[PDB]
């Protein structure tokens, strides 16, 4: 029962691997009391208010060092405390910033059910203010349809922090998607125009991207991959499933049911 | 004793019986007419 967290390395140089001690700190805090209150010992906040800190600083260090599962664990426990008990202090300071970060992560791993599901439980801050939370939903809305210039413009506009960790993944999953979509939009593209519509410049990266796919070049020309005619002019599979269907019609027509 | 177990079993059987009885009572008529 001591404020070991008061000796929190931070300031401008928290480079030291705090995990070596942090593990012991978490073990001792669990071994103490009320790691999850359920319902007991109400009005005692030292084991509670500290736990929020002993989790927020953990999760921030977690995002810095790229520990995806550990970050998921910290997210879970902190999302528990943030909501469950409303007899505590306003918490605040970092609640919205963290919640927005969690939503951003959900978008990054391409799960669109959870992002919508977890958009709930926020009363009205989506439009009330909470810029830390207007940014994720705005990015989602821009991403849902073809509007992509605004996405890249906003990638350089984050009031919270760098967020390069997730917007990176986003850039990659936009590059590959656009490469897939251009395969059927139109017959021909110019090489300069292709290099510029995709946001990369003129590095060997364009050449490599074309190599990774097909994109056979011509004299400043890109050939269209054309097929779109294999499926038509077929009846045999229809000629079998129609037979099945008509037999099914006659089945339950004269027999007593 | 073990009465609860027996109660459960017997109750389940009797609960089932009535539905069958009903679904057969209608069938007899049609044949008679």
């Amino acid at each position: 029962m001591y404020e070991q967290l008061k000796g929190e390395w931070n300031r401008k140089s928290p480079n030291l691997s705090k995990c070596g001690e942090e593990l012991g700190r978490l073990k001792l805090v669990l071994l103490e009391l009320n790691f999850l209150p359920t319902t007991g010992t109400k009005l005692t906040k030292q084991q509670l208010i500290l736990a929020r800190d002993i989790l927020e600083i953990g999760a921030q260090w977690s995002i810095l060092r790229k520990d995806i599962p550990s970050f998921e664990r910290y997210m879970a426990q902190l999302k528990c405390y943030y909501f469950d008990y409303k007899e505590q202090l306003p918490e605040s300071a970092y609640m919205h910033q963290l919640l927005g970060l969690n939503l951003l992560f959900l978008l990054s791993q391409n799960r669109v059910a959870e992002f919508h599901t977890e958009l709930e439980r926020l009363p009205a801050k989506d439009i009330q203010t909470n810029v830390y939370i207007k940014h994720p939903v705005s990015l989602e809305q821009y991403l849902m349809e073809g509007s992509y210039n605004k996405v890249f413009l906003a990638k350089g506009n984050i009031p919270a922090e760098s967020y390069t960790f997730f917007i990176d993944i986003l850039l990659d999953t936009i590059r590959d998607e656009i490469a897939g979509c251009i395969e059927k939009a139109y017959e021909k593209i110019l090489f300069t125009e292709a290099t510029r519509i995709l946001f990369f410049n003129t590095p060997k990266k364009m050449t490599d991207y074309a190599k990774k796919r097909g994109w056979v070049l011509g004299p400043n020309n890109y050939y269209s991959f054309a097929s779109q005619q294999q499926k038509p002019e077929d009846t045999t599979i229809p000629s079998t499933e129609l037979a099945k269907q008509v037999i099914e019609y006659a089945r339950q027509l004269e027999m007593i049911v | 004793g073990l009465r609860q177990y027996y109660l459960s079993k017997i109750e389940e059987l009797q609960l089932i019986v009535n539905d069958k009885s009903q679904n057969l009572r209608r069938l007899q008529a049609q044949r008679n007419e």
Binding site: V112, H116, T117, E120 | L15
Partner: protein, 142 residues
């Protein structure tokens, strides 16, 4: 001994919920309902797998937690005995649950069936809400 007590108690622990609804906590009402559900559905089939489900869902959504795990796996989905009054609100609840999770194809049909199961009485309290949602979701779907 519930050859009558069961269908008598249904209404009882339906007004019982309203009592807390108009006043104080509901979480421990949820605990009680959860217990009571398996207190039933184990005495072979006894019904109440209709009323208790609606009672549990009435304010499970109101507290704004969209848990769905147990609803997809619920064994009480099929009481089959609802007097054509419980079935409507049960279908309405499950339809809104399904529609809130980016699923529009099935919510339309299930909740339209729910709406058209509504009785003829002059009161239009819940029909207002079901209609409002039934046309928001249709705008969403295509």
């Amino acid at each position: 001994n519930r050859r009558a007590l069961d269908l008598v108690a249904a209404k009882c622990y339906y007004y019982h919920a309203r009592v807390y609804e108009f006043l104080d906590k509901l979480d421990v009402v949820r605990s009680f309902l959860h217990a009571r559900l398996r207190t039933a559905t184990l005495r072979h089939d006894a019904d109440g797998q209709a009323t208790l489900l609606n009672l549990l869902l009435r304010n499970y959504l109101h507290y704004s937690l969209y848990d769905q795990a147990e609803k997809l796996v619920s064994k009480s989905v099929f009481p089959e005995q609802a007097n054509n009054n419980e079935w409507a609100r049960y279908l309405y609840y499950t339809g809104r649950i399904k529609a809130i999770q980016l699923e529009y194809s099935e919510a339309r049909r299930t909740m339209t069936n729910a709406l058209r199961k509504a009785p003829q009485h002059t009161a239009v309290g819940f029909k207002q809400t079901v209609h409002k949602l039934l046309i928001v979701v249709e705008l969403l779907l295509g």
